[PDB]
Design an enzyme around this catalytic site. Structure first.
Site, PDB file in Angstrom:
ATOM      1  N   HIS B  62     -47.948 -28.771  16.341  1.00 46.92           N
ATOM      2  CA  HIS B  62     -48.271 -27.433  15.858  1.00 46.92           C
ATOM      3  C   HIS B  62     -48.974 -26.609  16.930  1.00 46.92           C
ATOM      4  O   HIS B  62     -48.652 -25.431  17.119  1.00 46.92           O
ATOM      5  CB  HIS B  62     -49.133 -27.523  14.599  1.00 46.92           C
ATOM      6  CG  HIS B  62     -49.818 -26.241  14.243  1.00 46.92           C
ATOM      7  ND1 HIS B  62     -49.196 -25.238  13.532  1.00 46.92           N
ATOM      8  CD2 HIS B  62     -51.073 -25.798  14.500  1.00 46.92           C
ATOM      9  CE1 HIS B  62     -50.036 -24.233  13.365  1.00 46.92           C
ATOM     10  NE2 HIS B  62     -51.182 -24.547  13.943  1.00 46.92           N
ATOM     11  N   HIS B 110     -57.449 -25.579  19.893  1.00 50.67           N
ATOM     12  CA  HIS B 110     -57.996 -24.789  18.798  1.00 50.67           C
ATOM     13  C   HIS B 110     -58.203 -25.605  17.529  1.00 50.67           C
ATOM     14  O   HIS B 110     -58.672 -25.056  16.526  1.00 50.67           O
ATOM     15  CB  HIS B 110     -57.092 -23.586  18.507  1.00 50.67           C
ATOM     16  CG  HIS B 110     -56.021 -23.860  17.498  1.00 50.67           C
ATOM     17  ND1 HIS B 110     -54.972 -24.722  17.739  1.00 50.67           N
ATOM     18  CD2 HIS B 110     -55.834 -23.382  16.246  1.00 50.67           C
ATOM     19  CE1 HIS B 110     -54.188 -24.764  16.678  1.00 50.67           C
ATOM     20  NE2 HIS B 110     -54.687 -23.960  15.758  1.00 50.67           N
ATOM     21  N   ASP B 111     -57.872 -26.900  17.549  1.00 51.99           N
ATOM     22  CA  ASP B 111     -58.058 -27.754  16.382  1.00 51.99           C
ATOM     23  C   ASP B 111     -58.584 -29.136  16.758  1.00 51.99           C
ATOM     24  O   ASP B 111     -58.328 -30.104  16.031  1.00 51.99           O
ATOM     25  CB  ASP B 111     -56.748 -27.899  15.599  1.00 51.99           C
ATOM     26  CG  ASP B 111     -56.751 -27.110  14.305  1.00 51.99           C
ATOM     27  OD1 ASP B 111     -57.654 -26.266  14.124  1.00 51.99           O
ATOM     28  OD2 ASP B 111     -55.851 -27.333  13.470  1.00 51.99           O
ATOM     29  N   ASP B 257     -52.367 -17.856  16.041  1.00 55.52           N
ATOM     30  CA  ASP B 257     -52.463 -18.786  14.921  1.00 55.52           C
ATOM     31  C   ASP B 257     -51.967 -18.150  13.628  1.00 55.52           C
ATOM     32  O   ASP B 257     -51.362 -18.827  12.789  1.00 55.52           O
ATOM     33  CB  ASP B 257     -53.903 -19.271  14.763  1.00 55.52           C
ATOM     34  CG  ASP B 257     -53.985 -20.733  14.379  1.00 55.52           C
ATOM     35  OD1 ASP B 257     -55.071 -21.177  13.950  1.00 55.52           O
ATOM     36  OD2 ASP B 257     -52.965 -21.442  14.506  1.00 55.52           O
ATOM     37  N   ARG B 414     -75.969 -54.654  12.673  1.00 55.82           N
ATOM     38  CA  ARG B 414     -74.522 -54.822  12.767  1.00 55.82           C
ATOM     39  C   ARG B 414     -73.775 -53.519  12.517  1.00 55.82           C
ATOM     40  O   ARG B 414     -72.740 -53.275  13.147  1.00 55.82           O
ATOM     41  CB  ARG B 414     -74.054 -55.898  11.787  1.00 55.82           C
ATOM     42  CG  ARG B 414     -73.906 -57.271  12.419  1.00 55.82           C
ATOM     43  CD  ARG B 414     -74.111 -58.379  11.404  1.00 55.82           C
ATOM     44  NE  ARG B 414     -74.326 -59.668  12.049  1.00 55.82           N
ATOM     45  CZ  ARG B 414     -75.519 -60.167  12.345  1.00 55.82           C
ATOM     46  NH1 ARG B 414     -76.632 -59.511  12.063  1.00 55.82           N
ATOM     47  NH2 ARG B 414     -75.596 -61.354  12.939  1.00 55.82           N
TER      48      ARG B 414
HETATM   49  N1  LIG Z   1     -52.450 -28.610   2.102  1.00 59.10           N
HETATM   50  C1  LIG Z   1     -52.619 -27.330   2.458  1.00 59.10           C
HETATM   51  N2  LIG Z   1     -52.484 -26.977   3.727  1.00 59.10           N
HETATM   52  C2  LIG Z   1     -52.680 -25.659   3.934  1.00 59.10           C
HETATM   53  C3  LIG Z   1     -52.996 -24.710   2.995  1.00 59.10           C
HETATM   54  N3  LIG Z   1     -53.120 -23.467   3.589  1.00 59.10           N
HETATM   55  C4  LIG Z   1     -52.884 -23.682   4.849  1.00 59.10           C
HETATM   56  N4  LIG Z   1     -52.607 -24.991   5.129  1.00 59.10           N
HETATM   57  C5  LIG Z   1     -52.301 -25.584   6.448  1.00 59.10           C
HETATM   58  O1  LIG Z   1     -53.419 -25.408   7.301  1.00 59.10           O
HETATM   59  C6  LIG Z   1     -53.106 -24.477   8.360  1.00 59.10           C
HETATM   60  C7  LIG Z   1     -54.227 -23.482   8.544  1.00 59.10           C
HETATM   61  O2  LIG Z   1     -55.493 -23.987   8.070  1.00 59.10           O
HETATM   62  P1  LIG Z   1     -56.395 -23.139   7.094  1.00 59.10           P
HETATM   63  O3  LIG Z   1     -57.286 -24.101   6.326  1.00 59.10           O
HETATM   64  O4  LIG Z   1     -55.583 -22.246   6.244  1.00 59.10           O
HETATM   65  O5  LIG Z   1     -57.345 -22.322   8.070  1.00 59.10           O
HETATM   66  P2  LIG Z   1     -57.645 -22.285   9.633  1.00 59.10           P
HETATM   67  O6  LIG Z   1     -56.627 -21.533  10.372  1.00 59.10           O
HETATM   68  O7  LIG Z   1     -57.861 -23.725  10.087  1.00 59.10           O
HETATM   69  O8  LIG Z   1     -59.032 -21.571   9.711  1.00 59.10           O
HETATM   70  P3  LIG Z   1     -59.991 -20.915  10.785  1.00 59.10           P
HETATM   71  O9  LIG Z   1     -60.443 -21.930  11.765  1.00 59.10           O
HETATM   72  O10 LIG Z   1     -61.109 -20.296   9.971  1.00 59.10           O
HETATM   73  O11 LIG Z   1     -59.175 -19.807  11.391  1.00 59.10           O
HETATM   74  C8  LIG Z   1     -51.773 -23.843   7.975  1.00 59.10           C
HETATM   75  O12 LIG Z   1     -51.013 -23.577   9.153  1.00 59.10           O
HETATM   76  C9  LIG Z   1     -51.117 -24.930   7.140  1.00 59.10           C
HETATM   77  O13 LIG Z   1     -50.457 -25.877   7.979  1.00 59.10           O
HETATM   78  C10 LIG Z   1     -53.140 -25.106   1.634  1.00 59.10           C
HETATM   79  O14 LIG Z   1     -53.417 -24.413   0.655  1.00 59.10           O
HETATM   80  N5  LIG Z   1     -52.930 -26.463   1.445  1.00 59.10           N
HETATM   81 MG   LIG Z   2     -53.827 -23.350  13.870  1.00 59.31          MG
END
Ligand SMILES: Nc1nc2c(ncn2[C@@H]2O[C@H](COP(=O)(O)OP(=O)(O)OP(=O)(O)O)[C@@H](O)[C@H]2O)c(=O)[nH]1
Ligand SMILES: [Mg+2]
Ligand SMILES: Nc1nc2c(ncn2[C@@H]2O[C@H](COP(=O)(O)OP(=O)(O)OP(=O)(O)O)[C@@H](O)[C@H]2O)c(=O)[nH]1
Ligand SMILES: Nc1nc2c(ncn2[C@@H]2O[C@H](COP(=O)(O)OP(=O)(O)OP(=O)(O)O)[C@@H](O)[C@H]2O)c(=O)[nH]1
Ligand SMILES: Nc1nc2c(ncn2[C@@H]2O[C@H](COP(=O)(O)OP(=O)(O)OP(=O)(O)O)[C@@H](O)[C@H]2O)c(=O)[nH]1
Ligand SMILES: [Mg+2]
Lengths: 84, 476, 476, 84, 84, 84
Positions: B62, B110-111, B257, B414
């Site tokens: 991604h 970014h993740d 993003d 431990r």
């Molecule tokens: N299971 C699930 N995945 C989601 C959902 N919405 C988005 N996603 C996934 O998560 C990605 C984005 O994550 P988000 O939690 O929406 O937010 P973010 O972009 O990480 O957030 P910021 O760091 O605040 O920008 C999307 O590209 C999807 O792949 C949802 O409701 N459920």
């Molecule tokens: Mg992203």
């Protein structure tokens, strides 16, 4: 060879029993140079940090050393609750 | 006066390159950073973390698509400025190289700070601490449900630190963990410009109250922790950023993003036989109310030929709009006080089309929903297993970290050896600096111990955490 | 006369962009190719194929490191030519963009055609066919152990095709499969310059005999199949390449793979506790006989700090040598007749240091050796399961592919539906062109059927093939 | 880097083809001192042990070296079936 | 894109803080016609059902909208504990 | 409802029995418009491609249709081995 559970439990019980009189215990442990026996040093002091007394025990067996530490702590508690 | 030479900083924190450098050796500095980031253990671990479905895309695949979209927005911006003969006036005459590289590396990492299981893994860490620290009881004068004697309000100069520590520890965010991971744990030693590209938000983690209306969007989420307060001030001094301000290049990474948010999940749904290509096309037609973007791709194919043109069609319509929005509001972005995002027109309404279809037909699947509940249970259980480590005293933990062979704490010792060596080294370095003869040592020690516990949990893959949880409960 | 405008071709095979293009729109053509390749199912599948160990590197993570090394060799070559004021004379004044992009995409998709389990998966396909076709019996006048009546020598004009088909089918190579996958199966429709960057060798798969001494290195391995003979001729006509010649940019991709050959495996060995960092350093010191490269990194750290500087130290010494070697032998590389590789000095001797340590302490581990034997058994078993498909007649297979509901072949029809739809479509398109009323139809039909069988096996991940083999044998 | 399967198969096929004329082949392989290239020596002799001829090939690439060995074996077979 | 956990926790904390004064909060949420932003309406009333006041907030971002709701609830609590 | 294994085996056996006389059989199968019964057409010809004869059988049951095809093939074999 390893320390028995009951001895450690008794040591902790004595530590808590003396801690119930708003006191504290510091623990130090090491190995001596040539006497070939482990050494444990205990210091008893109150919360304000005023040292009351210290003791050091040497022995090559863990069980006996911990029993001596526990009975010395019990004697300290007894003497400190005889007065004050 | 806009001058990008005062923003693109090629200096480092340790063994910084001094002296005047030419245009060629400046570019060489930004390539070693690329080599460091690409060959880092933090990036390799991204292929064992799930996006939605456990040929499906992972976080590594991604982030590779987000990197391509970022490149393309930067290239459009650079080419449009040359038509107006503003490249030399803005200081970008000899900086076109690093300009795209910084965006590309910010999009890549970014993740890297997300915890296992993602969002529900983030909530589980927050609730578990919220029950032990009760931050809402330290907002005002002493009342106290806190389970720690040292952090209970009782001493005006010491209560502020207590409430700051109590509030910060209940606010775990992945973006705030990214800065800590890149600087303190991994010790990558990146340039100042590269670190500023991953600072998405500016709100401190210990902030309690109402944010200023001038920065209500840039401070919607926590940005950094209290243990990095000294590092963020140096970064602001190095990049000439005011308080609660943003780096100019962060806006391009944010727009990339937003474009790649749901389109990949829709394609991944078809590969899992949730529906067919024709069914997805019918659903999109019903939800839309398309001809230039979706219809062109539909008639040009059938599964690996429908999305391949839809992506191109939406990029060719979204990238120029983002470039124009970046160029128009240039002084505010350069100052760092732009309180809006690049992406209320036909362009922003199109993304909601993909947004609404994904939440109704993909995110609501029973298999996706089950994994979210299982992940919440796994993280909560792991924190309970390590709870005895947090119940020890300062002297006992000091003896544990110093001797490593303790005859009084068999169970606690431990558990201590299971923590990674890098986290333990970071803890030792952090506590090896505070004044020992101060009335603040226990509070800082407890804060650093909690941070050490939080680093170990968040640095796991989903698959490793599940296995460790099952093994530590005598199930496997 | 060196002119890179005659080599960098931005035309396509289908819907080719015609007319004169400026420098900006030419760059846009090479970005859509990047979007197509990065978002392709063939690249996503690379994360489920193992390099050596089943935080370990996969083929996707390995190809990302090769891509970074390639970028850096191209940038050094481009910058060195500008110092000599030869960029305008060589035609690279307005082509510095695509020059690096082509190398970067060739390095990325340099392992997309490898079969499951790698090398031992390649041998298993070759032996199984060698027992059914006996290519060594068709070298001379009719003798015959062939198991197919139509391919047995009996008819001078028809025996040449028979021996060509028999020889080609027993020569499966991953590089030759890469061209077929990129053009016929995936239908990506890339530019001519991009396809030429993945043509590593020029020897035809049906070649039997001795190769010319002028091309004994460029024809050491098969390069393409017989089904792509018409496509390769068009590519040679488009890129102005003589017979058995190489594309100039292929040399840079070859040098990048040679640099990243064993260094990653040594780091992966430490993460699996085969040995420790100190043990590996001692082994390297013993094998070497280093100070500028290895010793500098050793004193600058401890696990994620030893390799991070070793890679930089070896790159800073290897990349300039490769750039100088490329620049010095420029006319021969441009002509495509250079019979050597870029990498007999202190530089080439250094790579053997990493080569010898890896083969003795990592590649000889019992766990690595066991997986090689298990993979050979899995591929052989899968080919035996589908053997009834190869025993049918032309009419029966035509009825199977046309009706899809056959009451005479219950077992054969069910095996047919397990093949992927893209391979079946490719087979239909291939056989939908040969003259039906010709005495060559059965031979071509059998060749295309064998190719269809080979495409299905080689397009699997290691994990999927094992599961399918266990399920089809009524074990799982 | 590793030897390709087809080259080994061709080498074995040539060995068997020459073995069909009641002959034998000995194989030796090593690494030279300073030439920085692997060396392979082949000897052709009949069953009774009378050596016919020998050859040695040096190269730093496995594929080219094996192809040279295979074509030399094929030339030997051709020459030995031209007469006798 | 999704709402952050801390904002929801703060909203719930404010709701409970105002509930400690024997009050109640009703929550409504929807999407507007053409403003292209979500809307949330809050109503504050006591246990007997006497409505005190209401408010409506519109925004296209969840985080900002929830923060505005939380700070409005905090201001309501502050004003209602200034007197009564 | 489905065709029985023995009938298919007998059909294949008859096909091979007639193939032992260097002959060949073409098979066609379809569904008729309004008769509501499946149709199977067989053609018998030698290797050179000279058609000898053809037949078409219609029936709504698979078992009976295949038995009729098998017995017609057997009669063809019998007649073709009576002479030539
Ligand atoms: N299971 C699930 N995945 C989601 C959902 N919405 C988005 N996603 C996934 O998560 C990605 C984005 O994550 P988000 O939690 O929406 O937010 P973010 O972009 O990480 O957030 P910021 O760091 O605040 O920008 C999307 O590209 C999807 O792949 C949802 O409701 N459920
Ligand atoms: Mg992203
Ligand atoms: N896992 C583990 N096993 C140990 C350890 N120390 C000793 N052992 C094993 O246990 C054996 C002896 O048991 P100990 O617990 O040391 O004591 P013991 O001999 O059973 O004790 P007594 O009955 O009091 O004499 C040794 O021979 C070892 O096989 C230790 O630290 N860890
Ligand atoms: N298990 C194992 N893996 C190896 C061995 N040698 C190399 N590898 C791995 O395979 C990679 C290279 O593959 P090779 O089979 O050596 O050859 P190649 O580069 O694919 O070959 P060409 O396409 O001809 O250039 C190395 O980077 C290693 O990761 C070996 O002996 N055993
Ligand atoms: N898997 C599968 N099951 C079938 C099929 N046709 C029918 N069935 C099932 O098998 C049942 C009938 O079995 P058939 O094999 O069709 O025949 P039958 O009724 O057992 O046959 P007789 O004993 O000759 O009457 C149906 O009710 C279905 O449940 C088919 O094509 N595939
Ligand atoms: Mg490689």
């Amino acid at each position: 060879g390893r320390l028995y559970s009951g001895n450690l439990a008794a040591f902790k019980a004595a530590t808590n029993k003396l801690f119930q009189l708003d006191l504290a215990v510091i623990y130090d442990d090491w190995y001596d140079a040539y006497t070939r026996k482990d050494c444990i040093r205990l210091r008893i002091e109150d919360r304000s940090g005023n040292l009351i007394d210290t003791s050091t025990f040497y022995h090559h067996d863990e069980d006996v050393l911990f029993n001596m530490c526990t009975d010395w702590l019990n004697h300290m508690y007894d003497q400190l609750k005889d007065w004050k | 006066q806009i001058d990008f030479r005062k923003k693109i900083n090629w200096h480092r924190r340790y063994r910084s390159p001094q002296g005047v450098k030419t245009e060629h050796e400046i570019l060489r500095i930004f390539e070693s950073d690329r080599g460091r980031i690409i060959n880092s253990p933090a990036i390799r671990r991204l292929q064992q973390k799930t996006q939605v479905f456990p040929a499906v895309r992972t976080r590594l695949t991604h982030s590779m698509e987000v990197q391509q979209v970022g490149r393309y927005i930067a290239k459009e911006i650079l080419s449009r400025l040359k038509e107006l003969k503003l490249l030399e006036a803005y200081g970008l005459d000899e900086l076109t190289g690093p300009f795209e590289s910084i965006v590309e590396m910010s999009c890549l990492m970014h993740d890297i700070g997300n915890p296992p299981f993602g969002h529900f893994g983030e909530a589980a860490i927050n609730d578990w601490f919220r029950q032990r620290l009760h931050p809402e009881d330290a907002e005002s004068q002493p009342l106290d449900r806190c389970s720690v004697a040292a952090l209970r309000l009782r001493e005006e100069p010491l209560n502020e630190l207590r409430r700051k520590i109590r509030q910060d520890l209940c606010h775990f965010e992945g973006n705030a963990q990214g800065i800590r991971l890149v600087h303190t744990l991994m010790r990558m030693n990146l340039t100042w410009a590269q670190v500023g590209g991953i600072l998405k938000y500016t709100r401190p983690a210990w902030w309690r109250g109402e944010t200023p209306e001038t920065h209500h969007y840039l401070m919607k989420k926590p940005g950094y922790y209290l243990s990095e307060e000294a590092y963020i001030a140096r970064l602001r001094k190095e990049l000439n950023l005011a308080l609660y301000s943003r780096f100019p290049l962060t806006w391009i990474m944010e727009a990339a993003d937003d474009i790649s948010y749901c389109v990949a999940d829709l394609e991944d749904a078809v590969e899992k036989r949730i529906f067919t290509v024709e069914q997805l096309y019918h659903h999109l037609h019903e939800a839309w109310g398309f001809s230039l973007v979706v219809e062109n791709a539909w008639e040009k194919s059938t599964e690996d030929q429908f999305f391949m043109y839809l992506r191109v069609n939406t990029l060719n319509k979204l990238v120029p709009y983002a470039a124009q929005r970046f160029i128009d509001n240039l002084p505010a972005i350069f100052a760092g006080t732009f309180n809006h995002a690049l992406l209320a027109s036909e362009c922003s309404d199109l993304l909601k089309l993909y947004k609404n279809v994904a939440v109704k037909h993909v995110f609501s699947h029973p298999d996706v929903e089950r994994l979210e509940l299982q992940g919440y249970r796994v993280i909560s259980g792991l924190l309970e297993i390590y709870r005895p480590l947090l119940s020890l005293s300062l002297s006992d933990f000091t003896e544990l970290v110093e001797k490593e062979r303790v005859k009084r704490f068999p169970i606690e010792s431990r558990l201590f050896h299971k923590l990674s060596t890098r986290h333990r080294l970071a803890y030792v370095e952090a506590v090896s600096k505070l004044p020992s003869d101060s009335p603040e040592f226990p509070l800082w020690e407890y804060y650093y111990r909690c941070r050490l516990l939080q680093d170990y949990i968040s640095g796991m893959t989903d698959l490793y955490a599940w296995d460790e949880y099952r093994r530590l409960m005598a199930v496997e």
